[PDB]
Write an enzyme that holds these catalytic residues in place. Structure first.
Site, PDB file in Angstrom:
ATOM      1  N   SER A  48       0.810  -1.238   0.000  1.00  0.00           N
ATOM      2  CA  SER A  48       0.000   0.000   0.000  1.00  0.00           C
ATOM      3  C   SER A  48       0.841   1.285   0.000  1.00  0.00           C
ATOM      4  O   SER A  48       0.308   2.347  -0.325  1.00  0.00           O
ATOM      5  CB  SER A  48      -1.051   0.030   1.112  1.00  0.00           C
ATOM      6  OG  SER A  48      -2.059  -0.996   0.937  1.00  0.00           O
ATOM      7  N   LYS A  51       0.692   3.545  -3.048  1.00  0.00           N
ATOM      8  CA  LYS A  51      -0.346   4.553  -3.299  1.00  0.00           C
ATOM      9  C   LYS A  51       0.249   5.963  -3.417  1.00  0.00           C
ATOM     10  O   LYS A  51      -0.340   6.816  -4.107  1.00  0.00           O
ATOM     11  CB  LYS A  51      -1.458   4.418  -2.261  1.00  0.00           C
ATOM     12  CG  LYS A  51      -2.271   3.110  -2.429  1.00  0.00           C
ATOM     13  CD  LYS A  51      -3.434   2.950  -1.490  1.00  0.00           C
ATOM     14  CE  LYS A  51      -4.250   1.674  -1.739  1.00  0.00           C
ATOM     15  NZ  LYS A  51      -3.418   0.478  -1.703  1.00  0.00           N
ATOM     16  N   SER A  96      -6.654   2.931   2.452  1.00  0.00           N
ATOM     17  CA  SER A  96      -5.849   2.078   1.575  1.00  0.00           C
ATOM     18  C   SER A  96      -6.742   1.288   0.624  1.00  0.00           C
ATOM     19  O   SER A  96      -6.612   0.068   0.590  1.00  0.00           O
ATOM     20  CB  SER A  96      -4.957   1.091   2.320  1.00  0.00           C
ATOM     21  OG  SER A  96      -4.032   1.725   3.171  1.00  0.00           O
ATOM     22  N   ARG A 228       3.462  -1.063  13.625  1.00  0.00           N
ATOM     23  CA  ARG A 228       4.150  -0.330  12.564  1.00  0.00           C
ATOM     24  C   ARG A 228       4.304   1.120  13.030  1.00  0.00           C
ATOM     25  O   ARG A 228       5.383   1.695  12.931  1.00  0.00           O
ATOM     26  CB  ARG A 228       3.343  -0.370  11.269  1.00  0.00           C
ATOM     27  CG  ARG A 228       3.256  -1.744  10.607  1.00  0.00           C
ATOM     28  CD  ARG A 228       2.264  -1.724   9.463  1.00  0.00           C
ATOM     29  NE  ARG A 228       0.870  -1.495   9.836  1.00  0.00           N
ATOM     30  CZ  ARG A 228      -0.100  -1.349   8.947  1.00  0.00           C
ATOM     31  NH1 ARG A 228       0.147  -1.494   7.658  1.00  0.00           N
ATOM     32  NH2 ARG A 228      -1.331  -1.100   9.334  1.00  0.00           N
TER      33      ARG A 228
HETATM   34  C1  LIG Z   1      -1.800  -2.031   1.752  1.00  0.00           C
HETATM   35  O1  LIG Z   1      -0.626  -2.410   2.005  1.00  0.00           O
HETATM   36  C2  LIG Z   1      -2.929  -3.064   1.915  1.00  0.00           C
HETATM   37  C3  LIG Z   1      -4.020  -2.567   2.882  1.00  0.00           C
HETATM   38  N1  LIG Z   1      -3.415  -1.958   4.116  1.00  0.00           N
HETATM   39  C4  LIG Z   1      -4.072  -2.376   5.149  1.00  0.00           C
HETATM   40  C5  LIG Z   1      -3.724  -2.278   6.410  1.00  0.00           C
HETATM   41  O2  LIG Z   1      -2.881  -1.409   6.777  1.00  0.00           O
HETATM   42  O3  LIG Z   1      -4.332  -3.052   7.193  1.00  0.00           O
HETATM   43  C6  LIG Z   1      -5.371  -3.032   4.770  1.00  0.00           C
HETATM   44  S1  LIG Z   1      -6.764  -1.816   4.685  1.00  0.00           S
HETATM   45  C7  LIG Z   1      -6.945  -0.939   6.265  1.00  0.00           C
HETATM   46  C8  LIG Z   1      -7.269  -1.875   7.426  1.00  0.00           C
HETATM   47  N2  LIG Z   1      -7.834  -0.933   8.424  1.00  0.00           N
HETATM   48  C9  LIG Z   1      -8.347   0.303   7.776  1.00  0.00           C
HETATM   49  C10 LIG Z   1      -9.821   0.605   8.083  1.00  0.00           C
HETATM   50  O4  LIG Z   1     -10.715   0.223   7.318  1.00  0.00           O
HETATM   51  N3  LIG Z   1     -10.075   1.329   9.207  1.00  0.00           N
HETATM   52  C11 LIG Z   1      -8.990   1.806  10.071  1.00  0.00           C
HETATM   53  C12 LIG Z   1     -11.423   1.739   9.625  1.00  0.00           C
HETATM   54  C13 LIG Z   1      -8.111   0.053   6.274  1.00  0.00           C
HETATM   55  C14 LIG Z   1      -4.992  -3.636   3.411  1.00  0.00           C
HETATM   56  C15 LIG Z   1      -4.469  -5.052   3.604  1.00  0.00           C
HETATM   57  C16 LIG Z   1      -3.528  -3.470   0.559  1.00  0.00           C
HETATM   58  C17 LIG Z   1      -2.500  -3.816  -0.506  1.00  0.00           C
HETATM   59  O5  LIG Z   1      -4.442  -4.572   0.747  1.00  0.00           O
END
Ligand SMILES: *C(=O)[C@@H]([C@@H]1N=C(C(=O)O)[C@@H](S[C@@H]2CN[C@H](C(=O)N(C)C)C2)[C@@H]1C)[C@@H](C)O
Ligand SMILES: *C(=O)[C@@H]([C@@H]1N=C(C(=O)O)[C@@H](S[C@@H]2CN[C@H](C(=O)N(C)C)C2)[C@@H]1C)[C@@H](C)O
Ligand SMILES: [Cl-]
Lengths: 243, 242
Positions: A48, A51, A96, A228
């Site tokens: 991600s 992005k 993301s 992280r």
């Molecule tokens: C990016 O690397 C990937 C995405 N990043 C994610 C992550 O950091 O977990 C998820 S989406 C993220 C999970 N929690 C967020 C949310 O909806 N709220 C905080 C309310 C969105 C995802 C694996 C991508 C390549 O899949």
């Protein structure tokens, strides 16, 4: 010394049965600091964190007109609830939202994508694989130190896209701000290909300096995703960059 | 500490290629490269891995000395010079993979892993069996990590005997005349893209040593002589060699 290794940070990882790297770059002093010089230079899928370049390219080509333009949900229910809704660039980066970004990548297409990543000097510059998933399971690889190099260019408006494109993406990177500091950053979580890792890359703005950072860490399950940011902030606190 | 010198880019351009040269001035403790990002990107070592493989084989007694003969197995390979008996010196000179694969098998995965860790050589996360990982992409190393490794070998600072280090430095001898000595090892990585050539080593002068590590895109074998030729153009420009 231009690069200092500080193994003392390793304690922040070990206290959670974790392994990883934090890289810091003091912009005023032009000096770097890391717990692990070797891992700092090891290249991984960006997941991600891609992005950031994806947004810049999309804006500069006019695939995204501005940060208000709405990308309608395509009606397919996905496992991440926040993806199952309409988004603009700000909320797509905040949550993301891969499917929005996959649509951008298809519209950019492979030739423009490749050319732009070359122009940005981004990682190994390799987009091999699917035009809309190469940053998750294709050939692209970037290290922590290379993330910093790229982010310093973005900070200074020195990437080969317009100033406007750079400013909008920096706005979309906004993650936290208080009276002490601003953080502009992007998380990543690479799961398709081993080794599974988490990323956090970005910078901390202070009144009279900027500290760039890029971290990655082993991520065998999603249990650890909060670390992280938490381990990065422990390092920042230890270094007296933030209270 | 480190200086980027893009004027060296012209030596790659003359030849419609791309690559990196890293130099280190041992007396002054300063480094120079045409490309800081590429200098720190990790590539398969290919035949440059014969330097650590040799040190480990000698140190464990898998290789008794530089005169021991490793007989040809009687199977004809693509590279003519491999189709004959070798010792350590000739096996290094002709990059004789099948000899070094047998060294690796006798060293064994556990000892190889531990010793490369001790040398701090290559990526933390090595994969692949002991006779293949160094051919198939299970280990990778950057030009600047090659320099750091060779600096330790030069000073007899690796965790193997002084004898092991002196024998490998003897085997690395590539060129000598009244002006300089070059101890080095070539590489040509073809099993995974980007295909590259390497040349890593150092130049001994009367009163200094310059370490060097270069790699360059190598889409066909026609350009292999550029590994040495480009390095030496840079050395000549920098007044290191006449
Ligand atoms: C990016 O690397 C990937 C995405 N990043 C994610 C992550 O950091 O977990 C998820 S989406 C993220 C999970 N929690 C967020 C949310 O909806 N709220 C905080 C309310 C969105 C995802 C694996 C991508 C390549 O899949
Ligand atoms: C090492 O990287 C690989 C070997 N290196 C080679 C090379 O540099 O071309 C070849 S062997 C080499 C070809 N010319 C030499 C010779 O026979 N004469 C100089 C007469 C030996 C090979 C690809 C290794 C991993 O295979
Ligand atoms: Cl803002």
């Amino acid at each position: 010394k231009e690069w200092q290794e500080n193994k003392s940070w390793n304690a922040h990882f070990t206290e959670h049965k974790s392994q990883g790297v934090v890289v810091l770059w003091n912009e005023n002093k032009q000096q770097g600091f890391t717990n692990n010089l070797k891992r700092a230079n090891q290249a991984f899928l960006p997941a991600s964190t891609f992005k950031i370049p994806n947004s810049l390219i999309a804006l500069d080509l006019g695939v995204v007109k501005d940060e208000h333009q709405v990308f309608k949900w395509d009606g397919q229910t996905r496992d991440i609830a926040t993806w199952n809704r309409d988004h603009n660039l700000i909320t797509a980066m905040k949550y993301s939202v891969v499917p929005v970004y996959q649509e951008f990548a298809r519209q950019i297409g492979e030739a423009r994508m490749s050319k732009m990543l070359h122009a940005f000097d981004y990682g190994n510059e390799d987009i091999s694989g699917n035009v809309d998933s190469f940053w998750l399971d294709g050939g692209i690889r970037i290290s922590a130190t290379e993330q910093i190099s790229f982010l310093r260019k973005l900070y200074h408006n020195k990437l080969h896209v317009s100033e406007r494109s750079q400013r909008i993406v920096k706005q979309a990177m906004l993650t936290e701000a208080n009276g002490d500091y601003i953080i502009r950053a992007k998380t990543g979580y690479s799961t398709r290909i081993e080794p599974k890792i988490g990323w956090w890359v970005g910078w901390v703005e202070l009144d009279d300096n900027v500290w760039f950072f890029a971290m990655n860490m082993d991520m065998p399950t999603s249990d650890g995703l909060g670390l992280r940011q938490a381990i990065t902030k422990e390092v920042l606190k230890q270094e007296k960059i933030i209270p």
